[PDB]
Curated annotation (Swiss-Prot), chains A, B:
Residue runs in coiled coils: none
UniProt family annotation: Belongs to the GST superfamily. Pi family.
Lineage start: Eukaryota, Metazoa, Chordata, Craniata, Vertebrata
Keyword Oxidoreductase assigned: no
Any single GO CC term annotated in Swiss-Prot or TrEMBL for this entry: TRAF2-GSTP1 complex
Protein name listed in UniProt: Glutathione S-transferase P
Catalytic activity: RX + glutathione = an S-substituted glutathione + a halide anion + H(+); prostaglandin J2 + glutathione = prostaglandin J2-S-(R)-glutathione; prostaglandin J2 + glutathione = prostaglandin J2-S-(S)-glutathione; prostaglandin A2 + glutathione = prostaglandin A2-S-(S)-glutathione
Domain GST N-terminal: 1-80
Localization (cell): Cytoplasm; Mitochondrion; Nucleus
Enzyme's top EC category: transferase
Organism: Homo sapiens
Main location: cytoplasm
EC number: 2.5.1.18
Domain GST C-terminal intervals: 82-203
Length: 209, 209
């Protein structure tokens, strides 16, 4: 640290890393980028891949949400207990990322027309995570191992936003359902999820969810 | 080890991890999955996210190409010299992944119609990596630090396939151009890139490139 999150006034790709920081008792600064500032071009041009989030950790400047998650993950000890667990954490996170990309595609590309189809395919997309849970202490702890990892936060956010998109989409998945309520119940996390900082921010930037 | 790569008879998302194995002097088994075997459904159903590559490392079974790259990366010591370098390696790899996704989209979704546009935007997509290089020992070594990492292999493959898509797309990028020739010149890598094992495999599965 100190940590600084440079992003638009949305939860989006910063929601999970924010939950991580909050739950780990970390302090950070939120640098909010309005549309006007982005449309002007200066900031965008300075970003490596021309996109936000931009993360500051002392003298270290990072880009890419998953790079930030892995950074906070290895640095804060939320990346598995060993190399094998670390690989499992990656496999989970990679899966979460694939579905997030499909979700964002729906939201920004063809929400109205493609929504029903997306919802039909959803259970097949959630299945893998339910399976992962059933293989780890009967799904009573975390997604990988007995300790929480950055993949847990990313998975939790994914499940939360999909529940807003299709309420009750977790009803057919017992372990996933229980996993969300359990994680969401974590003191520092519960406090964050209920805060104006989280609640008063739209999930996405186009008003859809 | 032992390592086993279960994949279709294409370079695709296994090309980079194969270059890594080869260049590091590693031995592995190639389990080739024909269309008939995949269309039958048994293997697909057993895959976590229903897709290949599937990787075997002794008793460890992994899925997701980047999970395999990171696995081989941390296990073989190709993941930066410290935590900061490791995060930079992720940032590079995340960027390579974003562009690979755009490329695959072109190849399978609308190659014919969207090709020219993709090629127009290409330099803006390659720029970040040229910049990364200019900031690391003047681009004379690797993408991050003085040692090679899994991100190097993934970046090299990306550059190779784009050069096949748009020959000379690296002509405006001196460091990227030099970086490819240098890496491609590496003994074990050069030997692999020239082999029937690599050469006689199509870049993609739809005959396009
Ligand atoms: N792969 C990147 C995606 C970043 C991204 O898509 N950023 C968007 C907002 S969520 C952005 O900055 N859009 C502005 C633009 O591209 O003009 C990540 O993982 O962070
Ligand atoms: N995100 C995955 C992508 C895997 C993937 O797209 N696999 C394709 C081949 S490149 C596949 O198995 N397609 C068969 C299917 O989905 O039916 C990774 O990084 O490996």
């Amino acid at each position: 640290p100190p940590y600084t999150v440079v992003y638009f006034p949305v939860r989006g790709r910063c929601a999970a890393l924010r939950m991580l920081l909050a739950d780990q008792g970390q302090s950070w600064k939120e640098e909010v980028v309005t549309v006007e500032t982005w449309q002007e071009g200066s900031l965008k041009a300075s970003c490596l891949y021309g996109q936000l989030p931009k993360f500051q950790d002392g003298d270290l400047t990072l880009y890419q949400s998953n790079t930030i998650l892995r950074h906070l993950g290895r640095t804060l000890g939320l990346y598995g207990k060993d190399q094998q667990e670390a690989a499992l954490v990656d496999m989970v996170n990679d899966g979460v990322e694939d579905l997030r990309c499909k979700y964002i595609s729906l939201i920004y590309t063809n929400y109205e027309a493609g929504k029903d189809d997306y919802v039909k395919a959803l259970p097949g997309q959630l299945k893998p995570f339910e399976t992962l849970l059933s293989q780890n202490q009967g799904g009573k702890t975390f997604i990988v191992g007995d300790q929480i990892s950055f993949a847990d936060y990313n998975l939790l956010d994914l499940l939360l936003i999909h529940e807003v998109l299709a309420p009750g989409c977790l009803d057919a998945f017992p372990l996933l359902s229980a996993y969300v309520g359990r994680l969401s119940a974590r003191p520092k996390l519960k406090a964050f999820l209920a805060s104006p900082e989280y609640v008063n921010l739209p999930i996405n930037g186009n008003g859809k969810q």
